[PDB]
């Protein structure tokens, strides 16, 4: 919804996201998936430089990603690390939504 929330939901300072821990918190409400970008915030914000009206943007660079994917046991997850492009909604020069991996 906004850059502050995007950071909380989708930027991780550790590649080893503690899935079973963090996914159970209110912010994620035990949902079945969440993609985290392992990066300091400024280079992620830079993706959206100059873009005013809401627009989805696919990164031209690949980034380190950490996914928390649910197992067959509700709320145990598997952490999967990968490298890929991702799509974000840019608005007023900042990412405000994570759209998906690999494509808009």
Q: Which of 53, 67, 57 is nearest to 22 (CA)?
A: 67
CATH class in words for 2-104: alpha beta
What gap in Å lies between CA 64 and CA 31, rounded to an integer?
Answer: 21
Q: Residues within the annotated binding site for substrate?
A: 31-35
What is the resolution in angstroms? 1.1
Contact 40, 15 (CB under 8 A): no
Cβ(66)–Cβ(101) under 8 Å? no
Boundaries of every domain in the chain: 2-104
Task: Give dist(CA 95, CA 87) in Å, integer.
Answer: 10
Question: Could you list the active site residues?
Answer: 10, 97
Rounded CA separation 5/78 (Å)? 24
Scanning the chain, the segments in alpha helix (DSSP H) are 3-10, 19-22, 41-45
Residues 6 or more apart whose CB falls under 8 angstroms from that of 87 comprise 56, 57, 58, 59, 98, 99, 100, 101, 102, 103, 104
Contact assessment for residue 38 and residue 67, using Cβ atoms and an 8 Å cutoff:
no
Q: Evaluate whether 45 touches 55 at the Cβ level (below 8 Å).
A: no
């Amino acid at each position: 919804q906004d850059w502050l929330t995007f950071q909380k939901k989708h930027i991780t300072n550790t590649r080893d996201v503690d899935c079973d821990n963090i996914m159970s918190t209110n912010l994620f409400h035990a949902k079945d998936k969440n993609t985290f970008i392992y990066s300091r915030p400024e280079p992620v914000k830079a993706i959206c430089k100059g873009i005013i009206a809401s627009k989805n943007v696919l990164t031209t660079s690949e980034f380190y990603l950490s996914d928390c994917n649910v197992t067959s046991r509700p709320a145990k997850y598997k952490l999967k690390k990968s490298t890929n492009k991702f799509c974000v909604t840019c608005e007023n020069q900042a990412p405000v939504h994570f759209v998906g991996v690999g494509s808009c």
